[PDB]
């Protein structure tokens, strides 16, 4: 979830609300942003067999028909055993399960009845490297100062040498998926103790563009060295076992480091630095934000950092246990969207203990690179920017799908119309929704060879 | 089994024109007693300010007797300053100031300072215009308190660094 | 307890025991580079001109004539007008006899009687040289 947030900020919140039970609230005393956000939280994922009318037509034409007429968002279909997120040029077979996003199962049932009357790894889904040594990837403070990192990912790690191992590959592997070209890959720099990183560097040897810096994320010298003011996303993670003295005080370094970065000034503003924080407690989320008016009894999903994508709560994983039981396909869709493509045989390859073994690229091995990826786009510029002013969401959804094949999932809109550099997520806005020139759209972009 | 129930808890009793302070953090005998000797001193000119102690663990017999000798001005409530529910119980917004005590006998002063600082964040989050005075183990941890937007030295917030004052 | 009743209590204490700890000094140390030095300029060197805590004795020196049959107020006035030192208190021997172990007297009255073997707590100024 955190790795996908680096590519598209606010994505973790979008999945947290989508696959969880959200209670809609009605009250005359709430702002306009809460009205749109709350409606998005009621969206849920459902599976339903497609109508006999839908057979024999491409997926792109089928999902736009549901949005235009049936008011449904179709994002994936069942392919025989495989899950295809927004497939390109894939015809619909007989009795194919489809994944829909809707307020409830009432609209979903309308889909069943409807009539007009050595470069990559062995699997080919990830980039590969010739087993770079850990010592070659260690950067000193002076070495980091004399180099410039732009558009990179900073992983702030709070870990002791004896701390339990949390798999850092689960964060870098999604960032090293075969969908991204080698030039557009995001550099990853890890700030933490080399003693802890060495204990798990074995699975990071073959992943390109990884740098390790000695120091602590709390120290401002290290953060200035790696230039977190220009990074695409700064992730704060803690691997230390809590002392269990107080359940609420489990995450002290995470909160202190989060506030430390916001107060830093660069020659520019720390509050403008994109940031995500792993919080193991639900009640500490409100501490990240300061200019809110929420009574501390506020629910988690209505809290300011949560709705804005800047805070990740591990409690949603426990809530995902209930979701899996009621819908077996719920976790299949989630894994296909956040892991960057994790085939079942990839576990078998890793079961041999040789790490990520590479393979020679062939013609039909390279076909695995052609799959959709989670991304974010802006309406500031480009030929699609003309939907920013006086434009409807449905018009944006139809035009992007027909011309580019992108599937619009939601919106990432500024809090204040004014632009306070802190946005909130709206999941699947209605057809008649009004857009803004400074709005960002969650899309599932295709793969363009080049 | 039904008869047995806890003895510490409940919302702080309210009084007309009542001024009180909340003391949280490390609550032991030889730490509370020293503070109570000066705050409730014999020769202090007549100002009546109640003292509210909020600790997660119930007091032991050594400290229970101290509270008995000051029953008219000292009350104890079981809870955590980090819990917003417990903040309402001690009536934080009615408190004149909030005092945080530090564990002098701690293996890791940095860990103790981080926990103490995080307590101030919870108090400041609950009420912006509250005066907080904190005991801090190490001098280099003072910078973290400056990162809190609600921390204002001119408003009354102050830091007592044991290491700096003792060796100074 | 003292800090709560008087907010300025700790401000005076810190200004007297830390040797001068400006608020921006914490910011310098917050960068993790330690005590970073700087090139001395004319108005940077003006920060050296501040009072310091010191102790003086009436055994010798031109001020020693207050030791015998001298009042504390006379010592306080003469030191301030001529040297600028501010007398805070006395460090007087236990035994008149001199057991090499003294006790402190904070701000003795105007009519206090001095002794030739008494030490005075003073806030001496800075003398460039
Ligand atoms: Mg939901």
Curated annotation (Swiss-Prot), chain C:
Tissue: Expressed in muscle cells, neurons of the CNS and PNS, mushroom bodies, a limited number of cells in embryonic and larval midgut and in epithelial-derived tracheal cells. During pupariation and embryogenesis, it is expressed in muscles many hours prior to the appearance of functional channels.
Post-translational modification, as annotated: Phosphorylated. Phosphorylation may be mediated by both PKA and SRC kinases, which activate the channel activity. Phosphorylation by PKA is however unclear. Indeed, although modulation of channel activity requires Pka-C1, it does not interact with the whole PKA holoenzyme.
Superkingdom field: Eukaryota
Cellular localization per UniProt: Membrane
Entry's family note: Belongs to the potassium channel family. Calcium-activated (TC 1.A.1.3) subfamily. Slo sub-subfamily.
Function: Potassium channel activated by both membrane depolarization or increase in cytosolic Ca(2+) that mediates export of K(+). Its activation dampens the excitatory events that elevate the cytosolic Ca(2+) concentration and/or depolarize the cell membrane. It therefore contributes to repolarization of the membrane potential. Kinetics are determined by alternative splicing, phosphorylation status and its combination interaction with Slob and 14-3-3-zeta. While the interaction with Slob1 alone increases its activity, its interaction with both Slob1 and 14-3-3-zeta decreases its activity.
Comment text on domains: The S4 segment, which is characterized by a series of positively charged amino acids at every third position, is part of the voltage-sensor. The pore-forming domain (also referred as P region) is imbedded into the membrane, and forms the selectivity filter of the pore. It contains the signature sequence of potassium channels that displays selectivity to potassium.
Complex formation: Homotetramer; which constitutes the calcium-activated potassium channel. Interacts with Slip1. Interacts with Slob, and, indirectly with 14-3-3-zeta via its interaction with Slob. Interacts with Pka-C1 and Src kinases, which can bind simultaneously to it.
Name under which the protein is recorded: Calcium-activated potassium channel slowpoke
């Amino acid at each position: 979830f955190i790795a996908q947030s680096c590519l598209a900020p606010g994505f973790s919140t979008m999945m947290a609300n989508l696959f969880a039970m959200r209670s809609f609230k009605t009250s005359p005393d709430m702002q306009s942003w809460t009205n749109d956000y709350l409606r998005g939280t009621g969206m849920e994922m459902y599976t339903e067999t497609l109508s006999p009318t839908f057979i024999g037509i491409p997926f792109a034409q089928a999902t736009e028909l549901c949005f235009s007429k049936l008011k449904l968002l179709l994002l994936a279909i069942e392919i025989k055993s495989k899950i295809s997120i927004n497939p390109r040029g894939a015809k619909i077979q007989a009795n194919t399960q489809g994944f829909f996003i809707a307020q409830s199962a009432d609209e979903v049932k309308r889909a069943w009845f409807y009539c007009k009357a050595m470069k990559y790894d062995s699997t080919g889904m990830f980039h590969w490297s010739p087993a770079k040594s850990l010592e070659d990837c260690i950067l000193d403070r002076n070495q980091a100062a004399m180099t410039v990192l732009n558009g990179h990912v900073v992983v702030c790690l709070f870990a002791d040498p004896d701390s339990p191992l949390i798999g850092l590959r689960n964060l870098v592997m999604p960032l090293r998926a075969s969908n991204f070209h080698y030039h557009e890959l995001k550099h990853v720099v890890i700030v933490g103790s080399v003693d802890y990183i060495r204990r798990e560097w074995k699975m990071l040897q073959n992943l390109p563009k990884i740098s390790v810096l000695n120091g602590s994320p709390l120290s401002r010298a290290d953060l200035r060295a790696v230039n977190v003011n220009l990074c695409d996303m700064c992730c704060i993670l803690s691997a230390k076992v809590p002392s269990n003295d107080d359940p609420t005080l489990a995450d002290k370094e995470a909160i202190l480091a989060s506030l430390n970065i916001k107060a830093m000034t660069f020659d520019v503003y720390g509050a403008n630095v994109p940031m995500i924080t792993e919080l193991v407690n639900d009640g500490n989320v409100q501490f990240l934000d300061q200019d809110d008016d929420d009574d501390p009894d506020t629910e988690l999903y209505l809290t300011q950092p949560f709705a804005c994508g800047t805070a990740f709560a591990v409690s949603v994983l426990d809530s995902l246990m209930s979701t899996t039981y009621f819908n077996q396909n719920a976790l299949t869709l989630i894994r296909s969207l956040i892991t960057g493509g994790a085939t079942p045989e990839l576990e078998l390859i890793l079961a041999e203990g040789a790490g990520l073994r590479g393979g020679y690229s062939t013609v039909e091995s390279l076909s695995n690179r052609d799959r959709c990826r989670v991304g974010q786009i802006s309406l500031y510029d480009g030929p699609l920017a003309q939907f920013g002013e006086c434009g409807k969401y449905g018009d944006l959804f139809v035009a992007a799908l027909k011309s580019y094949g992108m599937l619009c999932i939601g919106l990432y809109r500024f809090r204040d119309t004014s632009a306070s550099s802190k946005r909130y997520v709206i999941t699947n806005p209605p057809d008649d929704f009004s857009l803004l020139p400074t709005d960002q759209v969650f899309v599932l972009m295709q793969f363009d060879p080049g | 089994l039904i008869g047995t129930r806890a003895k510490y808890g409940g919302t702080l009793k309210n009084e007309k024109g009542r001024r009180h302070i909340v003391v949280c953090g490390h609550i032991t005998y030889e730490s509370v007693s020293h503070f109570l000797k000066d705050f409730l001193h014999e020769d202090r000119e007549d100002v009546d300010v109640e003292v509210v102690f909020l600790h997660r663990k119930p007091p032991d017999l050594e400290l229970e007797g101290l509270f008995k000798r000051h029953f008219t001005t000292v009350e104890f409530f079981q809870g955590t300053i980090m819990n917003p529910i417990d903040l309402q119980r001690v009536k934080v917004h009615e408190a004149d100031a909030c005092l945080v005590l530090a564990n002098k006998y701690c293996q890791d002063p940095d860990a103790e300072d981080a926990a103490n600082i995080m307590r101030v964040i919870s108090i400041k989050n609950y009420s912006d215009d509250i005066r907080v005075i904190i005991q801090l183990m190490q001098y280099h941890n003072k910078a973290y308190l400056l990162n809190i937007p609600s921390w204002d030295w001119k408003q009354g917030d102050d830091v007592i660094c044991l290491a700096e004052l003792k060796l100074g």
